[PDB]
Structures are given as structure tokens and as C-alpha cells.
From a paper:
Viral determinants of virulence and transmissibility are still poorly understood, although lysine at position 627 of the polymerase subunit PB2 (PB2-627K) is now known to be important for avian influenza virus adaptation to mammals. Here, we report that a basic amino acid at position 591 of PB2 can compensate for the lack of PB2-627K and allows efficient replication of highly pathogenic H5N1 and pandemic H1N1 viruses in mammalian species.
The PB2 protein of the pandemic H1N1 virus shows an altered polar surface when compared to the avian H5N1 PB2-627K protein. Interestingly, our structure of the pandemic H1N1 PB2 protein reveals that PB2-591R fills the cleft found in H5N1 PB2 proteins in this area (compare Fig. 4A and 4B). In particular, the side chains of R591 and S590 in the structure of H1N1 PB2 occupy what would otherwise be the positively charged cleft in the H5N1 PB2. PB2-591R is located 4 Ångstrom from PB2-627E, with the side chain of R591 rotated away from PB2-627E and participating in hydrogen-bonded and water-mediated hydrogen bond networks with the main chain carbonyl backbone between residues A587 and T588, even though the two residues have space to assume rotomers that could form a neutralizing salt bridge. The R591 residue in H1N1 PB2 thus affects both the shape and charges on the surface of the protein, which may affect its interaction with other viral and/or host factors. Our H1N1 structure shows that while the side chain of PB2-590S is in close proximity (<4 Ångstroms) to 627E, the hydroxyl moiety points away from the glutamatic acid and does not participate in hydrogen bonds or polar interactions with the side chains of 591R or 627E. Furthermore, the side chain atoms of PB2-590S also protrude into the positively charged cleft and may provide a steric platform that reduces the conformational flexibility of neighboring residue 627E. These findings suggest that PB2-590S constrains any side chain at position 627. Our X-ray crystal structure of the C-terminal portion of a pandemic H1N1 PB2 protein reveals changes in surface shape and charge created by PB2-591R which may prevent an inhibitory host factor as suggested by Mehle & Doudna from binding to PB2, hence allowing efficient influenza virus replication.
Author numbering: 541 to 741
Write the structure that this text describes.
Amino acid sequence: GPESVLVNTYQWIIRNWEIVKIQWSQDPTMLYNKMEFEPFQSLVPKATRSRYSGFVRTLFQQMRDVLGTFDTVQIIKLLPFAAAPPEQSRMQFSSLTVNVRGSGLRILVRGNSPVFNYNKATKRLTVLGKDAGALTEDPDEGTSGVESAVLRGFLILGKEDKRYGPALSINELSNLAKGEKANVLIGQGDVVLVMKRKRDS
């Protein structure tokens, strides 16, 4: 069933992470088009599939372009959304819908959610209340706290910094100049400092 499709997709990515990481790094196009992501894509609503994919593919390229910000879990989380033919847009998506429990459940782009829950204490991924397997320590993992694959055209720099003013919503960022910093209401009471990048991916 649909719940098992999600679990099995993420399980598959983890089991095959050595080759998936390599392709993600050097031939993402042939990774994104793998048939193994088609069942997951069937669960992504037809109307938003392509925009989700353009968004995610752009976020992944930010990660490649902004050196030393590799985030293993973020790649695994978002990867299956990259499989649809991409469509461009200006929008920020804070969450991505999958059709599972008879209905839309949303995976949060930043951090854990009920659908996608990575446990840093146990090093295991849980997807819809099911184990999707263990992650191994990767020396390439970014340790600086800069998040390059959450917002399209922005880096999350770290904690709220009151100097840069009161928080903007995700939908209020489009007037920021290249290189300008602001506080942003990223989710769940969390305010983070962000920077609009000068060059887009």
C-alpha cells in the first residue's frame, strides 16, 4: 500500500546510499529519472509534482554550489520529489504533500515531521511509524550550521539575530536584495537568520 511505498522508497535510498550519493554528486539527472522513484511519484499530487521537483532540484544545486554544506538526511528526505519533470516557479514550499493515509500528509522541508522522522540519538530513520534503517557517519557532513537546501535562493545562516530586525514570513522575502540578511519565521516558533544569495543555482 501507499504507506509501504513511502517506507520502501526511503529504505531503498539508504540501502543504496553509496551509489546514490555518487550520482547525486556527479550525474544527478540519471539519478532523478530512475524508475525506482515512480511509485513515490504516483503518491505526489499530479498538480504540484513538477513544481515540487523544480524546487527540490534547485535546492540540491544550491547544496552542490555552496561548499561544505552537505546534509545527508536532507538529500534522502527530498530526493524522491526530484523525480518528476521539473517546472520553475518563484514560490517557497515549507512542506511537500504525499497522498498516503487516504489524504494529504505533508513532509516538512526543514527538519522532522510525523511522516519523516530522523532520530539523531539512534541514527535511524522512521517513516510513517516504520523503521527505514540506519544512517552511517559521513565525514563529508556539514558541521557549520549553514543550511543551503531549505529555501530557494537563500542560505539559513543560524540563530535569529535581533540586529537584522523582526522576522519575515517565507512569503515576504522576495524584496530582499542580493546578499541582504533577515530573520525569518521558518516554522513551529523557530526564527532563523537567512541570507539571500548573490548568484542563483
